[PDB]
Swiss-Prot record:
InterPro entries: A-amylase/branching_C, Branching_enzy, GlgB, GlgB_N_E_set_prok, Glyco_hydro_13_cat_dom, Glyco_hydro_13_N, Glyco_hydro_b, Glycoside_hydrolase_SF
Biological process annotations from GO: glycogen biosynthetic process
Reactions it catalyzes: Transfers a segment of a (1->4)-alpha-D-glucan chain to a primary hydroxy group in a similar glucan chain
Active site: D305, E356
Pathway note: Glycan biosynthesis; glycogen biosynthesis
PANTHER family membership: 1,4-ALPHA-GLUCAN-BRANCHING ENZYME (PTHR43651:SF3)
Name of this protein: 1,4-alpha-glucan branching enzyme GlgB
CDD domains xrefs: AmyAc_Glg_BE (cd11322), E_set_GBE_prok_N (cd02855)
Biological role stated in the UniProt entry: Catalyzes the formation of the alpha-1,6-glucosidic linkages in glycogen by scission of a 1,4-alpha-linked oligosaccharide from growing alpha-1,4-glucan chains and the subsequent attachment of the oligosaccharide to the alpha-1,6 position.
Subunit text: Monomer.
Length: 621
C-alpha cells in the first residue's frame, strides 16, 4: 500500500537487492516524486527541496521495515533540487541523496551549495549493434588497447573550460579512432566535490555529475562512442568514499556506510575509511551501483583501484591482532569482491572487470570457483616498475641491469594482464613519460618509442594515459588541458605517429592477440653487454619477431636466430624518419641464412638502429 513491497524489504535487509536504485533515491512520476532513504537509526527524516521552501516540517518521510524511510511529495518535479534532514536524538544534519541520480551545479559548498536533482533517466539508445557485437568476450584472445582519459583535462574549449560530455564526443572519438585504440577508460565520473581528487573521493555513486553535463549528456557520449566502434571503461571506487560532511559519513547519526567502533577509552582506535562490507545495506548499495553503471549507461567495463586496501586491513604494527582467530585478510571484503564479479558476468556477460592490486595476491583474475577474485584483467604493476626502472637508467649502465628488463617474463602469465602506463605514473614527483627518459632530446624520444615498441610486444593488453602518446613534457596537470601544441614539434608528432602505427599493427595482426605462454617465446635474452633482446610473438598461423636495441650504439651485422627460413620483411621500424628517427633499417627482402644462431635453424643478419625497436615477419603470401 506504500512505496515498498514486502519483497523489497526482505531483499534489502538480507542484502540481495541488487537493483535497489529502482526504489531508493528520488523517483518522479507525472505529478510528484517518491523519496526513499536508508537510515535505520534516525528518529526522523524529512525531504527539503525547492518545492516546499526547504521547510524541514513540510514533508516528513515515514518509516518502513529494514531501516528504510519513504514519502511522496506532490508537485516535486524533475529539475527540483532537494536534500534530506536526518534527525538522530538531539543531533540533526542535512545530507545529499546517496542514490542521487544527479547533483546540482553547486556540488560542493566550495562550488556554491549542494543539492541532489530529481531526474528521470529517460534516453533512447542507438547502439544496439555495438551492444550485440560487443560480445567483448574472452577479449583475452583479441586486441585490447586502452586510452586512459581524465575528461576535464584532455582538451579545453576556449580557456580553463572543459568540453562537455556532448562536445567531447566527436573530437575524442576522432582522436581515439586515428590513434587506433579499442577503448577509452575514464577516471571516475561519479560525483566528487574536489576536482583535484581526480574523481577518486566520490560523494555521489549514482550521479555522473553536472560538471561536464547531465546524465543524458554522458549517455549521449557513450552512445556516440559505441556507434564509432569504441568501448568505454569506467573507473569505479568501492574501496572508500569521500569524507565530506554532506556525503555518506555517519549519515543516520551512527556508523552506517563505514565500519563501527570498538571500545575507545584510548585503545588503538581502528575504525572506518572503507565501506562496511558486512552490512547488507552496503552490499546492496555497491553491487546495485555496479549494475547501475552497466545497465543505465551501457558501459563496457569497470576498473577497481586499490584492491589491496580492500583485501587487507593491515595499516600498522598492531591493529586487528594475530593469535589463532583470523588473519590480516578482510574476509567480508574478499567475499564482496567475489560476489561483485560473479554478479557482473551473470547479468552482463562480456562486460569487463579490471583490478589494480599491488601486493601480488594470487589469482586476482582467476575464477571464483578456484579461490580467485573473479576479475577479467589485472594491471601488471610489476612489469611497469621494472620497465620504468630500467628505461630510466642511463644507457651506459643498462648492461648492469639486464635482469630488470627480462624479469617480467617470469611472471607475465600468472594472470590475465593489462600492461598499464597510467596517470598515477606522471604526477607528483615522478615526471612525465618523456621527462623520465634519459639523455638528449632525440634520445628521450627514441627511448619512448623503444619503450612503446616493447610494451606492445610484451604479453598483455595495453593501457596508456593521455599525453603519453606524444611524449608531453610536463607531468599531467588536472587544472589545465594537455600540451597539444607540442604536436608541431617533430619528435612529439613522431612519437604520436608511432603509437598510431603500433595500434594498427596490434589490431590487424593476430600474432599479438594471445598473451598466454603459447604466444611468446624467447629468441635471446643473454646480450647483457649490448643491452639487446630478441623475442617472438606467435598466435594463429602468424609470427612477429621483436628486436630491441636499448643503447644508442648502432649494431651492424647483428645476427638473430629465426625458426622459419625464407625472405623476411621489416613491418615496423622506430628509427624511420617519419617517427623522428634517423632512417636506419633493413629494407626490401631480408633473406634468412641457413646457418644456425641462437639454437635456431636459420638466422637473420640485421642493422640495429640506435635506441630502436625492430618488428619483422616472415613472408607468407
Amino acid at each position: 500500500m506504500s512505496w515498498l513491497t514486502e519483497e523489497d524489504i526482505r531483499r534489502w535487509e538480507s542484502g540481495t537487492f541488487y537493483d535497489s536504485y529502482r526504489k531508493l533515491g528520488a523517483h518522479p512520476d507525472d505529478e510528484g516524486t517518491w523519496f526513499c532513504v536508508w537510515a535505520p537509526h534516525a528518529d526522523g527524516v524529512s525531504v527539503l527541496g525547492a518545492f516546499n521552501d526547504w521547510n524541514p516540517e513540510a514533508n516528513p518521510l515515514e518509516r518502513y521495515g529494514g531501516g528504510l524511510w519513504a514519502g511522496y511529495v506532490p508537485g516535486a518535479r524533475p529539475g527540483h533540487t532537494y536534500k534530506y534532514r536526518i534527525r538522530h536524538g538531539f543531533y540533526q544534519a542535512d545530507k545529499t541523496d546517496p542514490y542521487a541520480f544527479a547533483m546540482e551545479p553547486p556540488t560542493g559548498s566550495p562550488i556554491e551549495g549542494l543539492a541532489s536533482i530529481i531526474t528521470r533517466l529517460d534516453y533512447t539508445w542507438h547502439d544496439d549493434e555495438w551492444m550485440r557485437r560487443r560480445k567483448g568476450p574472452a577479449s583475452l584472445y583479441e586486441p585490447v588497447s586502452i586510452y586512459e582519459v581524465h575528461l576535464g583535462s584532455w582538451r579545453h574549449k576556449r580557456p580553463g573550460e572543459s568540453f562537455s560530455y556532448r562536445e567531447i564526443a566527436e573530437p575524442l572519438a576522432d582522436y581515439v579512432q586515428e590513434m587506433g585504440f579499442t577503448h577509452v577508460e575514464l577516471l571516475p565520473v561519479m560525483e566528487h566535490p574536489y576536482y583535484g581528487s581526480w574523481g577518486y573521493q566520490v560523494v555521489g555513486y549514482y550521479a555522473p555529475t553536472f560538471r561536464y553535463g547531465s546524465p543524458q549528456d554522458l549517455m549521449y557520449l557513450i552512445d556516440y562512442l559505441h556507434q564509432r566502434g569504441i568501448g568505454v571503461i569506467l573507473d569505479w571506487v568501492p574501496s572508500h568514499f569521500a569524507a565530506d560532511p554532506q556525503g555518506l559519513v555517519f549519515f543516520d547519526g551512527t556508523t552506517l556506510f563505514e565500519y563501527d567502533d570498538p571500545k575507545m577509552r584510548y585503545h588503538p582506535d581502528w575504525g572506518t575509511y572503507v565501506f562496511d562490507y558486512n552490512k547488507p545495506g552496503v552490499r546492496n548499495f555497491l553491487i546495485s551501483n555496479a549494475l547501475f553503471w552497466l545497465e543505465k549507461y551501457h558501459v563496457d567495463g569497470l576498473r577497481v583501484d586499490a584492491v589491496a586496501s580492500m583485501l587487507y586491513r593491515d595499516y600498522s604494527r598492531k591493529e586487528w591482532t594475530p593469535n589463532i582467530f583470523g588473519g590480516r585478510e578482510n574476509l567480508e571484503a574478499i567475499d564482496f569482491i567475489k560476489k561483485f564479479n560473479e554478479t557482473v558476468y551473470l547479468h552482463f556477460p562480456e562486460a569487463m572487470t579490471i583490478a589494480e592490486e599491488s601486493t601480488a595476491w594470487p589469482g586476482v583474475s582467476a575464477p571464483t570457483y578456484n579461490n580467485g577474485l573473479g576479475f577479467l584483467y589485472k594491471w601488471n604493476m610489476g612489469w611497469m616498475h621494472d620497465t620504468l626502472d630500467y628505461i630510466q637508467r642511463d644507457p651506459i649502465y643498462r648492461k648492469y641491469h639486464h635482469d630488470e628488463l627480462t624479469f617480467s617474463l617470469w611472471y607475465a602469465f600468472s594472470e590475465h594482464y593489462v600492461l598499464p602506463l597510467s596517470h598515477d605514473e606522471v604526477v607528483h614527483g615522478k615526471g612525465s613519460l618523456w621527462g623520465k627518459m634519459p639523455g638528449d632530446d632525440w634520445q628521450k624520444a627514441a627511448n619512448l618509442r623503444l619503450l612503446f615498441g616493447h610494451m606492445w610486444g610484451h604479453p598483455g593488453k595495453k593501457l596508456l594515459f593521455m599525453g603519453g602518446e606524444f611524449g608531453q613534457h610536463h607531468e599531467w596537470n588536472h587544472d589545465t588541458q594537455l600540451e597539444w601544441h607540442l604536436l608541431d614539434q617533430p619528435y612529439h608528432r613522431g612519437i604520436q605517429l608511432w603509437v598510431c602505427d603500433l595500434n594498427h599493427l596490434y589490431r590487424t595482426n593476430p600474432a599479438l592477440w594471445h598473451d598466454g605462454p603459447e604466444g611468446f617465446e624467447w629468441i635471446d635474452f643473454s646480450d647483457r653487454d649490448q643491452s639487446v633482446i630478441c623475442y617472438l610473438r606467435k598466435n594463429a598461423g602468424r609470427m612477429l619477431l621483436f628486436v630491441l636495441n636499448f643503447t644508442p650504439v648502432p649494431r651492424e651485422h647483428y645476427r638473430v636466430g629465426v625458426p622459419i627460413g625464407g625472405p623476411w620483411h621489416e613491418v615496423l621500424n622506430s628509427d624511420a624518419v617519419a617517427y623522428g628517427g634517423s632512417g636506419m633499417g633493413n629494407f626490401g627482402r631480408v633473406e634468412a641464412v641457413p646457418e644456425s644462431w641462437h639454437g635456431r635453424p636459420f638466422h637473420l643478419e640485421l642493422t640495429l638502429p640506435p635506441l630502436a625497436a625492430l618488428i619483422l615477419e616472415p613472408e607468407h603470401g
